[PDB]
Amino acid sequence: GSRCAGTVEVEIQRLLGKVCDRGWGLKEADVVCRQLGCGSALKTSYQVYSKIQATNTWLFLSSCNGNETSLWDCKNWQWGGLTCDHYEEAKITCSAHREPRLVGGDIPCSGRVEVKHGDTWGSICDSDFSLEAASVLCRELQCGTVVSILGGAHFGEGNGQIWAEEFQ
Amino acid sequence: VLSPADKTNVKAAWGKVGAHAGEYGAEALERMFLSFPTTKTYFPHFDLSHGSAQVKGHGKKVADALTNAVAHVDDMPNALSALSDLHAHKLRVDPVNFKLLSHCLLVTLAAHLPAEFTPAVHASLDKFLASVSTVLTSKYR
Amino acid sequence: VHLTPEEKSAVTALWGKVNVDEVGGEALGRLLVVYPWTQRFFESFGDLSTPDAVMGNPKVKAHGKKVLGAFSDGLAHLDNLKGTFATLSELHCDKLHVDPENFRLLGNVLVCVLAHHFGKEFTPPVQAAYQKVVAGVANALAH
Ligand code: HEM
Ligand code: HEM
Ligand SMILES: *[C@@H]1O[C@H](CO)[C@@H](O)[C@H](O)[C@H]1NC(C)=O
């Protein structure tokens, strides 16, 4: 769904391909997230939004440090020549899949909730945001524990688009 | 072959093993079962889970046998004659499993007695365990 | 066989605290002491009769450092061990004529050294993981 969550698809010389997860930890995962520009890597898995096709060729990552600015820049990455049948495809969910922010509030950790769906910042309907979701939002922004959930545009109506996802 | 210095080192090392021998043997059996699952085929009637009372009892028996061998280091074939007959004929344990158990015993002793597992003492204990295995695997056919 | 992520994490965590400059030398010295026929290949390393001479040999320590670096290289590429150890296996098989069982003996001695160094931290699960690692290294370094 979002640009920074899902399987790692690779285009090399107009050839579609997907990364095999052998030798694929979180160190290589955050290199991809940094390459796409979405912070660090959260998990080598994603919540599926749409089906994708299957490609015969695979990208194999032997090992690389994890501080590289791009996946191609880290040493000895193999493109094709092996089958990822014994292993699985390499998935990733970067930190900007749903990055929250609080706007419109006159105090540091209060305001209208806005969540970035990869690159676009959009509001949230108060029927799609539970107390657990607000707790996760406050924890992620290092704002501690949630005090209240104020619906009906308490901090003013946002300008843009409203997301249609209920956070479970 | 066990030199007199090697016998001295083995006797000292097993003496400082002392009363912890039963749980040393239990840990060695657990390490053999986890690292080398092929040795579990010789224990189909045992509960092989971690912390098993049956595995702990068998480790106590193994360590008591090793204590008897240490005390009779000059007459080990006679000390282990019953065990030699048992393992070689009734159980038909293949000698590679004996070497695996010797390695796991050495690992247990290294992990539990790091100060006294000197390279000379490690070599002496390896020689003693090889002697035990050879005595127990001699009659194998 | 593929190594499980928990086993890989345990191996990496235990290897992070391994003294590269000393653990390899300790393992090589223990191999030369326990299995004296392995001293046949290191006749150019000087005195190797007394165990104290073997463990205190500077050449033995340097070669153990190199061996442990090769172990680390094979650890970083656990899924591709034959490819990473092709050159070393060819060296040992043709230039040095080292018996493949010596690699398994050195793996077992290295496991003993790790247990000796880490005490109870070398749990039976991480020992099983390291046994898989050293078996893969020896098989990739053999034939
Ligand atoms: C240093 C090596 C070993 C020692 C000192 C040793 C010692 C012993 C002792 C004392 C017993 C008790 C027998 C009795 O009380 O009648 C025993 C039984 C047995 N051993 Fe070993 N053993 C060794 C190696 C092995 C290995 C490596 C295996 C298998 C991989 C093995 C398989 C068995 C089995 C299956 C029994 C029968 C236990 C039962 O039926 O409850 N032994 N051994
Ligand atoms: C088990 C894993 C082992 C690994 C990973 C390993 C690794 C290495 C490495 C990195 C080198 C240096 C290659 C070079 O200088 O071009 C080497 C050379 C050598 N290895 Fe091994 N080794 C292992 C086991 C053994 C064993 C068990 C023996 C003997 C019993 C042995 C004997 C030698 C010798 C004699 C040399 C050449 C010495 C020299 O160049 O001065 N290796 N090995
Ligand atoms: C990453 O860290 C390594 C240290 O192992 C260093 O050599 C390399 O230059 C670093 N890369 C970047 C892009 O900072």
Coordinates of C-alpha atoms and ligand atoms in Angstrom, one line a residue:
Chain A
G1 CA 0.0 0.0 0.0
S2 CA 2.5 2.6 1.1
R3 CA 5.7 3.2 -0.7
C4 CA 7.8 2.3 2.3
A5 CA 6.2 -1.0 3.3
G6 CA 6.1 -4.3 1.4
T7 CA 8.3 -6.7 -0.5
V8 CA 11.6 -5.4 -1.8
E9 CA 11.2 -5.3 -5.6
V10 CA 14.4 -4.7 -7.6
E11 CA 14.8 -3.2 -11.1
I12 CA 18.2 -3.8 -12.7
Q13 CA 18.5 -3.2 -16.5
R14 CA 14.7 -3.1 -16.9
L15 CA 14.4 -6.6 -15.2
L16 CA 11.9 -7.0 -12.4
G17 CA 13.1 -8.9 -9.4
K18 CA 12.7 -9.4 -5.7
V19 CA 15.3 -9.8 -2.9
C20 CA 15.7 -13.2 -1.3
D21 CA 15.8 -13.1 2.5
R22 CA 18.8 -15.3 3.0
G23 CA 21.5 -13.3 4.7
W24 CA 18.8 -10.5 5.1
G25 CA 18.6 -9.2 8.7
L26 CA 17.5 -5.8 9.9
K27 CA 20.9 -4.3 9.1
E28 CA 20.3 -4.8 5.4
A29 CA 16.7 -3.8 5.9
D30 CA 17.4 -0.3 7.1
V31 CA 19.8 0.2 4.2
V32 CA 16.8 -0.2 1.9
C33 CA 14.7 2.1 4.1
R34 CA 17.5 4.7 4.1
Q35 CA 17.8 4.2 0.3
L36 CA 14.1 4.9 -0.2
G37 CA 14.3 7.6 2.5
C38 CA 12.0 6.3 5.3
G39 CA 14.1 6.2 8.4
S40 CA 15.1 2.9 9.9
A41 CA 13.7 -0.6 9.5
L42 CA 11.0 -1.8 11.9
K43 CA 10.4 -5.4 10.8
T44 CA 11.1 -7.8 8.0
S45 CA 7.4 -8.2 7.3
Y46 CA 4.4 -6.1 6.2
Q47 CA 0.7 -6.1 6.3
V48 CA -0.4 -7.1 2.8
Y49 CA -2.4 -4.5 0.8
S50 CA -2.3 -5.8 -2.8
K51 CA -1.1 -9.0 -4.6
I52 CA 2.1 -8.8 -6.5
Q53 CA 3.4 -11.1 -9.3
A54 CA 6.3 -13.6 -8.9
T55 CA 9.7 -13.1 -10.7
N56 CA 12.2 -15.9 -11.4
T57 CA 15.3 -13.8 -10.7
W58 CA 16.3 -12.8 -7.2
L59 CA 18.7 -10.4 -5.5
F60 CA 21.0 -12.1 -2.9
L61 CA 22.7 -10.1 -0.2
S62 CA 25.7 -11.9 1.2
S63 CA 26.3 -9.3 4.0
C64 CA 27.0 -5.6 4.3
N65 CA 27.6 -3.2 7.2
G66 CA 24.2 -1.4 7.4
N67 CA 25.4 2.2 7.4
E68 CA 25.5 2.4 3.6
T69 CA 23.3 5.0 1.9
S70 CA 22.2 2.6 -0.8
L71 CA 21.8 -1.2 -1.2
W72 CA 24.0 -1.2 -4.3
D73 CA 26.8 0.5 -2.5
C74 CA 27.3 -2.3 0.1
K75 CA 29.7 -5.1 -0.8
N76 CA 29.0 -8.2 -2.8
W77 CA 25.3 -8.3 -3.7
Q78 CA 24.4 -11.0 -6.1
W79 CA 21.8 -10.4 -8.8
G80 CA 20.4 -13.6 -10.1
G81 CA 22.1 -16.9 -10.6
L82 CA 20.5 -18.6 -7.6
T83 CA 17.0 -19.8 -6.7
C84 CA 15.2 -18.5 -3.5
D85 CA 13.2 -21.8 -3.2
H86 CA 14.7 -22.9 0.2
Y87 CA 14.4 -19.4 1.5
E88 CA 11.6 -16.8 1.3
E89 CA 11.2 -13.3 -0.2
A90 CA 12.6 -10.4 1.7
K91 CA 9.9 -8.1 3.2
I92 CA 10.3 -4.8 5.0
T93 CA 8.2 -2.2 6.8
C94 CA 10.1 1.1 7.3
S95 CA 9.4 3.6 10.1
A96 CA 7.6 5.9 7.7
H97 CA 4.8 3.4 6.7
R98 CA 2.5 5.3 9.1
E99 CA 4.5 8.1 10.8
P100 CA 2.4 10.1 13.2
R101 CA 2.6 13.8 14.1
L102 CA 0.7 16.2 16.2
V103 CA -0.2 19.6 14.7
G104 CA -2.4 22.5 15.8
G105 CA -1.6 22.2 19.5
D106 CA 0.0 25.0 21.6
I107 CA 1.7 22.5 23.8
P108 CA 4.5 20.0 22.7
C109 CA 2.5 16.7 22.8
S110 CA -1.1 17.6 21.9
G111 CA -2.7 18.4 18.6
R112 CA -4.6 17.0 15.6
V113 CA -3.4 13.6 14.6
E114 CA -1.7 13.4 11.2
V115 CA -0.2 10.2 9.8
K116 CA 2.2 10.1 6.9
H117 CA 1.3 7.3 4.4
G118 CA 4.8 7.1 3.0
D119 CA 5.0 10.7 1.8
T120 CA 1.5 12.3 2.1
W121 CA 0.3 13.8 5.4
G122 CA -3.4 13.2 6.1
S123 CA -5.8 13.5 9.0
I124 CA -7.6 10.7 10.8
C125 CA -11.3 10.4 11.5
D126 CA -11.9 10.0 15.2
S127 CA -13.9 6.8 14.6
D128 CA -10.7 5.1 13.3
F129 CA -8.5 5.9 16.2
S130 CA -8.8 3.9 19.4
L131 CA -7.1 4.3 22.8
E132 CA -4.5 1.7 22.0
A133 CA -3.7 3.5 18.7
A134 CA -3.4 6.8 20.6
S135 CA -1.1 5.1 23.2
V136 CA 1.1 3.8 20.3
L137 CA 1.1 7.3 18.8
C138 CA 2.1 8.9 22.1
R139 CA 4.8 6.3 22.7
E140 CA 6.3 6.6 19.2
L141 CA 6.5 10.4 19.4
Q142 CA 8.2 10.0 22.8
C143 CA 5.2 11.7 24.4
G144 CA 4.6 9.1 27.1
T145 CA 1.0 8.1 27.9
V146 CA -2.1 9.4 26.2
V147 CA -4.2 11.7 28.4
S148 CA -7.3 12.0 26.1
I149 CA -8.6 11.5 22.6
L150 CA -10.3 14.6 21.3
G151 CA -12.5 14.1 18.3
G152 CA -14.5 16.5 16.2
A153 CA -11.5 18.5 15.1
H154 CA -10.7 19.9 18.6
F155 CA -7.4 21.4 17.4
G156 CA -8.9 22.6 14.1
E157 CA -9.9 20.9 10.9
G158 CA -6.9 19.7 8.9
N159 CA -6.3 20.7 5.2
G160 CA -5.7 17.8 2.8
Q161 CA -7.0 14.3 2.8
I162 CA -8.5 12.0 5.5
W163 CA -7.2 8.4 5.8
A164 CA -9.7 5.6 5.6
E165 CA -8.0 3.1 7.9
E166 CA -9.1 1.9 11.3
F167 CA -6.1 1.2 13.5
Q168 CA -6.5 -2.2 15.2
Chain B
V1 CA 47.9 -43.5 25.7
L2 CA 47.6 -42.0 29.2
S3 CA 51.0 -40.9 30.5
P4 CA 51.5 -40.7 34.3
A5 CA 51.3 -36.9 34.0
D6 CA 48.0 -37.2 32.0
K7 CA 46.6 -39.6 34.7
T8 CA 47.6 -37.0 37.4
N9 CA 45.9 -34.2 35.5
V10 CA 42.7 -36.3 34.9
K11 CA 42.6 -37.4 38.6
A12 CA 42.9 -33.7 39.7
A13 CA 40.4 -32.4 37.2
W14 CA 37.8 -35.1 38.1
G15 CA 38.5 -34.5 41.8
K16 CA 37.6 -30.8 41.4
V17 CA 34.6 -31.9 39.4
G18 CA 33.7 -33.7 42.7
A19 CA 30.1 -33.8 43.7
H20 CA 28.9 -31.8 40.7
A21 CA 29.6 -34.9 38.5
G22 CA 25.9 -35.9 38.2
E23 CA 24.8 -32.6 36.8
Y24 CA 27.9 -32.4 34.7
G25 CA 26.9 -35.7 33.1
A26 CA 23.3 -34.5 32.7
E27 CA 24.5 -31.3 31.0
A28 CA 26.8 -33.4 28.8
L29 CA 24.0 -35.7 27.8
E30 CA 21.8 -32.6 27.0
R31 CA 24.5 -31.1 24.9
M32 CA 25.0 -34.4 23.0
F33 CA 21.3 -34.6 22.4
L34 CA 20.9 -31.1 21.1
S35 CA 24.2 -30.7 19.2
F36 CA 24.0 -34.2 17.7
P37 CA 20.4 -35.4 17.4
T38 CA 21.6 -38.6 15.8
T39 CA 22.6 -39.8 19.3
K40 CA 19.0 -39.6 20.4
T41 CA 18.2 -42.8 18.4
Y42 CA 19.8 -44.8 21.2
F43 CA 17.4 -43.3 23.8
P44 CA 13.9 -44.0 22.4
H45 CA 12.4 -44.7 25.8
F46 CA 13.9 -41.5 27.4
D47 CA 12.2 -38.1 27.9
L48 CA 14.9 -36.0 26.1
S49 CA 13.5 -32.6 26.9
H50 CA 15.6 -30.1 28.8
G51 CA 15.8 -30.7 32.6
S52 CA 14.5 -34.2 32.3
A53 CA 14.7 -36.3 35.5
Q54 CA 15.5 -39.4 33.4
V55 CA 18.3 -37.7 31.5
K56 CA 19.6 -36.3 34.8
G57 CA 19.6 -39.8 36.3
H58 CA 21.4 -41.2 33.3
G59 CA 24.0 -38.4 33.5
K60 CA 24.5 -39.3 37.1
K61 CA 25.1 -42.9 36.1
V62 CA 27.5 -41.8 33.4
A63 CA 29.5 -39.6 35.8
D64 CA 29.6 -42.4 38.4
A65 CA 31.1 -44.6 35.7
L66 CA 33.6 -42.0 34.8
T67 CA 34.5 -41.6 38.5
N68 CA 35.1 -45.4 38.8
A69 CA 37.2 -45.2 35.6
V70 CA 39.3 -42.4 37.1
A71 CA 39.8 -44.3 40.4
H72 CA 40.8 -47.3 38.3
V73 CA 42.8 -45.5 35.6
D74 CA 45.4 -48.2 35.6
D75 CA 42.7 -51.0 35.3
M76 CA 40.0 -49.2 33.2
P77 CA 39.2 -52.3 31.0
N78 CA 38.3 -54.2 34.1
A79 CA 36.4 -51.3 35.7
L80 CA 34.4 -50.8 32.5
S81 CA 34.1 -54.4 31.5
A82 CA 30.4 -54.6 32.2
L83 CA 29.8 -51.2 30.4
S84 CA 32.0 -52.3 27.5
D85 CA 29.9 -55.5 27.1
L86 CA 26.7 -53.5 27.4
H87 CA 27.4 -50.7 25.0
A88 CA 29.2 -53.0 22.5
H89 CA 26.6 -55.8 22.3
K90 CA 23.3 -55.0 23.9
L91 CA 23.0 -51.4 22.8
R92 CA 25.3 -51.6 19.8
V93 CA 26.3 -47.9 20.2
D94 CA 28.4 -46.8 17.3
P95 CA 31.8 -45.3 18.4
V96 CA 31.2 -41.9 16.7
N97 CA 28.5 -41.3 19.4
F98 CA 31.1 -42.1 22.0
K99 CA 33.4 -39.4 20.6
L100 CA 30.5 -37.0 20.5
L101 CA 29.8 -37.6 24.1
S102 CA 33.5 -37.2 25.0
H103 CA 33.5 -33.9 23.2
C104 CA 30.3 -32.8 25.0
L105 CA 31.8 -33.8 28.4
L106 CA 34.9 -31.8 27.5
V107 CA 32.7 -28.8 26.6
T108 CA 30.8 -29.2 30.0
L109 CA 34.1 -29.3 31.9
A110 CA 35.4 -26.3 30.1
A111 CA 32.2 -24.3 30.7
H112 CA 32.1 -25.3 34.4
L113 CA 35.8 -25.4 35.3
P114 CA 37.5 -22.7 33.1
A115 CA 40.3 -22.0 35.6
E116 CA 41.4 -25.7 35.7
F117 CA 40.8 -26.5 32.0
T118 CA 44.4 -25.8 31.0
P119 CA 45.6 -27.0 27.6
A120 CA 47.6 -29.7 29.3
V121 CA 44.6 -30.7 31.4
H122 CA 42.3 -30.4 28.4
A123 CA 44.6 -32.8 26.5
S124 CA 44.8 -35.2 29.5
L125 CA 41.0 -35.2 29.9
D126 CA 40.6 -35.8 26.1
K127 CA 43.0 -38.7 26.3
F128 CA 41.1 -40.2 29.3
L129 CA 37.8 -39.9 27.5
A130 CA 39.3 -41.5 24.4
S131 CA 40.5 -44.3 26.7
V132 CA 37.0 -44.7 28.1
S133 CA 35.5 -44.7 24.6
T134 CA 38.0 -47.2 23.3
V135 CA 37.3 -49.5 26.2
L136 CA 33.6 -49.2 25.7
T137 CA 33.8 -49.5 21.9
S138 CA 36.5 -52.3 21.8
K139 CA 34.0 -55.2 21.6
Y140 CA 31.8 -53.4 19.0
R141 CA 31.2 -55.6 16.0
Chain C
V1 CA 21.0 -27.0 6.0
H2 CA 19.6 -23.5 6.6
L3 CA 20.3 -22.1 10.1
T4 CA 17.3 -20.8 12.1
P5 CA 17.2 -17.0 12.8
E6 CA 17.3 -17.7 16.6
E7 CA 20.4 -19.8 16.2
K8 CA 22.0 -17.2 13.9
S9 CA 21.3 -14.5 16.4
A10 CA 22.8 -16.6 19.2
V11 CA 25.9 -17.3 17.2
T12 CA 26.4 -13.7 16.3
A13 CA 25.8 -12.4 19.8
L14 CA 28.3 -14.9 21.2
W15 CA 30.8 -14.1 18.5
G16 CA 30.6 -10.4 19.2
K17 CA 32.4 -10.8 22.5
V18 CA 35.0 -13.2 21.1
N19 CA 38.6 -11.9 21.4
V20 CA 39.7 -12.3 17.8
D21 CA 43.4 -11.8 18.7
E22 CA 43.4 -14.5 21.4
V23 CA 40.6 -17.0 20.9
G24 CA 41.9 -18.3 17.5
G25 CA 45.5 -18.7 18.9
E26 CA 44.1 -20.5 21.9
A27 CA 42.1 -22.9 19.7
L28 CA 45.1 -23.6 17.4
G29 CA 47.3 -24.2 20.4
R30 CA 44.8 -26.5 22.0
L31 CA 44.5 -28.4 18.6
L32 CA 48.3 -28.8 18.5
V33 CA 48.4 -29.9 22.1
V34 CA 45.5 -32.4 22.2
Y35 CA 46.2 -33.7 18.7
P36 CA 50.0 -33.7 18.3
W37 CA 49.9 -34.9 14.7
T38 CA 48.5 -31.5 13.8
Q39 CA 52.0 -30.2 14.8
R40 CA 53.2 -31.9 11.6
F41 CA 51.9 -29.1 9.5
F42 CA 53.5 -26.4 11.7
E43 CA 57.1 -27.6 11.8
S44 CA 58.1 -24.2 10.6
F45 CA 56.5 -22.5 13.6
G46 CA 59.5 -23.4 15.9
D47 CA 59.3 -25.3 19.2
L48 CA 56.0 -27.2 19.6
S49 CA 56.8 -30.0 22.1
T50 CA 55.8 -28.6 25.5
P51 CA 52.2 -27.5 25.7
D52 CA 53.5 -24.2 27.2
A53 CA 55.7 -23.8 24.1
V54 CA 52.7 -24.5 21.8
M55 CA 50.5 -22.0 23.5
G56 CA 53.2 -19.3 23.9
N57 CA 54.4 -19.6 20.3
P58 CA 54.0 -16.2 18.5
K59 CA 53.7 -17.9 15.1
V60 CA 50.9 -20.2 16.5
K61 CA 49.1 -17.1 17.9
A62 CA 49.3 -15.3 14.6
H63 CA 48.1 -18.3 12.6
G64 CA 45.3 -18.8 15.1
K65 CA 44.3 -15.1 14.6
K66 CA 44.2 -15.8 10.8
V67 CA 42.2 -19.0 11.3
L68 CA 39.7 -17.2 13.6
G69 CA 39.4 -14.4 11.0
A70 CA 38.6 -17.1 8.4
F71 CA 36.0 -18.4 10.9
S72 CA 34.5 -14.9 11.1
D73 CA 34.4 -14.6 7.4
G74 CA 32.6 -17.9 7.1
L75 CA 30.2 -16.7 9.9
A76 CA 29.3 -13.6 8.0
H77 CA 28.4 -15.8 5.0
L78 CA 26.9 -18.8 6.8
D79 CA 24.4 -19.4 3.9
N80 CA 27.3 -19.5 1.4
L81 CA 30.1 -21.5 3.0
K82 CA 31.5 -23.5 0.0
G83 CA 31.9 -20.4 -2.1
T84 CA 33.7 -18.5 0.7
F85 CA 35.9 -21.4 1.6
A86 CA 36.7 -22.8 -1.9
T87 CA 40.2 -21.2 -2.0
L88 CA 41.0 -22.3 1.6
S89 CA 39.8 -25.8 1.0
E90 CA 41.9 -26.0 -2.2
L91 CA 44.9 -24.7 -0.3
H92 CA 44.5 -27.3 2.4
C93 CA 43.7 -30.2 0.1
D94 CA 46.5 -29.6 -2.5
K95 CA 49.2 -27.4 -1.1
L96 CA 49.1 -28.6 2.5
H97 CA 47.4 -32.0 2.3
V98 CA 45.5 -31.4 5.5
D99 CA 43.1 -34.2 6.3
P100 CA 39.5 -33.0 6.5
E101 CA 39.0 -34.6 9.9
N102 CA 41.5 -32.0 11.2
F103 CA 39.0 -29.3 10.4
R104 CA 36.3 -31.0 12.4
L105 CA 38.8 -31.5 15.2
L106 CA 39.7 -27.8 15.1
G107 CA 36.0 -26.9 15.1
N108 CA 35.4 -29.1 18.2
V109 CA 38.5 -27.6 19.9
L110 CA 37.2 -24.1 19.1
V111 CA 33.8 -25.0 20.6
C112 CA 35.7 -26.1 23.7
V113 CA 37.7 -22.9 23.8
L114 CA 34.4 -20.8 23.5
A115 CA 32.9 -22.8 26.3
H116 CA 36.0 -22.3 28.4
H117 CA 36.0 -18.6 27.7
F118 CA 32.2 -18.0 28.2
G119 CA 31.4 -20.3 31.1
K120 CA 27.6 -20.9 31.5
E121 CA 26.9 -18.5 28.7
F122 CA 27.8 -21.3 26.3
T123 CA 24.4 -22.9 26.7
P124 CA 23.5 -26.2 25.1
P125 CA 21.4 -24.4 22.5
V126 CA 24.1 -22.0 21.5
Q127 CA 26.5 -25.0 21.5
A128 CA 24.3 -26.8 19.1
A129 CA 24.2 -23.7 16.9
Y130 CA 28.0 -23.5 17.0
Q131 CA 28.3 -27.2 16.3
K132 CA 26.2 -26.6 13.2
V133 CA 28.4 -23.7 12.3
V134 CA 31.7 -25.6 12.7
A135 CA 30.3 -28.6 10.8
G136 CA 29.4 -26.3 7.9
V137 CA 32.8 -24.7 8.0
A138 CA 34.6 -28.1 8.0
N139 CA 32.4 -29.6 5.3
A140 CA 32.9 -26.4 3.1
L141 CA 36.7 -26.7 3.8
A142 CA 36.9 -30.4 2.9
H143 CA 37.2 -32.4 -0.3
Ligands
HEM1 C1 32.2 -41.9 28.2 C2 31.1 -42.4 27.6 C3 30.0 -43.2 28.3 C4 29.9 -43.7 29.6 C5 30.9 -43.4 30.7 C6 28.6 -44.4 29.7 C7 28.2 -45.0 30.8 C8 26.9 -45.6 31.0 C9 26.4 -46.2 32.2 C10 27.1 -46.1 33.6 C11 25.2 -46.7 31.9 C12 24.3 -47.4 32.9 C13 24.1 -48.9 32.6 C14 23.5 -49.6 33.7 O1 23.3 -49.0 34.8 O2 23.2 -50.8 33.6 C15 25.0 -46.5 30.5 C16 23.8 -46.9 29.8 C17 23.5 -46.6 28.5 N1 24.3 -45.9 27.6 FE1 26.2 -45.1 28.0 N2 28.0 -44.4 28.4 C18 28.8 -43.7 27.6 C19 28.6 -43.5 26.2 C20 27.3 -43.7 25.6 C21 26.9 -43.0 24.4 C22 27.7 -42.0 23.6 C23 25.6 -43.5 24.2 C24 24.7 -43.1 23.0 C25 24.9 -42.2 22.1 C26 25.3 -44.4 25.2 C27 24.1 -45.1 25.3 C28 23.6 -45.7 26.5 C29 22.3 -46.3 26.6 C30 21.2 -46.4 25.6 C31 22.2 -46.8 27.9 C32 21.0 -47.5 28.4 C33 20.3 -46.6 29.5 C34 19.0 -47.2 29.8 O3 18.6 -48.2 29.1 O4 18.3 -46.6 30.6 N3 26.3 -44.5 26.1 N4 26.0 -45.8 29.9
HEM2 C1 39.1 -25.7 10.7 C2 39.1 -24.5 10.1 C3 40.4 -23.8 9.5 C4 40.4 -22.6 9.0 C5 39.2 -21.7 8.9 C6 41.7 -22.3 8.5 C7 42.2 -21.1 7.9 C8 43.4 -20.9 7.4 C9 43.9 -19.7 6.8 C10 43.1 -18.3 6.8 C11 45.1 -19.8 6.4 C12 46.1 -18.8 5.8 C13 46.1 -19.0 4.2 C14 47.3 -18.3 3.6 O1 48.1 -17.8 4.4 O2 47.3 -18.2 2.4 C15 45.5 -21.2 6.6 C16 46.7 -21.8 6.3 C17 47.2 -23.0 6.9 N1 46.4 -23.9 7.6 FE1 44.4 -23.7 8.1 N2 42.5 -23.4 8.8 C18 41.7 -24.3 9.4 C19 42.2 -25.6 9.9 C20 43.5 -26.0 9.8 C21 44.0 -27.2 10.5 C22 43.1 -28.1 11.3 C23 45.3 -27.4 10.2 C24 46.3 -28.4 10.6 C25 46.0 -29.5 11.3 C26 45.7 -26.2 9.3 C27 46.9 -26.0 8.8 C28 47.3 -24.9 8.0 C29 48.6 -24.6 7.6 C30 49.9 -25.5 7.8 C31 48.5 -23.4 6.9 C32 49.7 -22.7 6.2 C33 50.7 -22.1 7.2 C34 51.4 -21.0 6.6 O3 51.0 -20.5 5.6 O4 52.5 -20.6 7.2 N3 44.5 -25.5 9.1 N4 44.4 -21.9 7.2
LIG3 C1 30.4 2.3 7.5 O1 31.2 1.8 8.6 C2 32.5 1.3 8.1 C3 33.2 0.7 9.3 O2 33.2 -0.7 9.3 C4 33.3 2.3 7.4 O3 34.5 1.7 6.8 C5 32.4 2.9 6.2 O4 33.1 4.0 5.6 C6 31.1 3.4 6.7 N1 30.3 3.9 5.6 C7 29.7 5.1 5.6 C8 28.9 5.4 4.4 O5 29.8 5.9 6.6

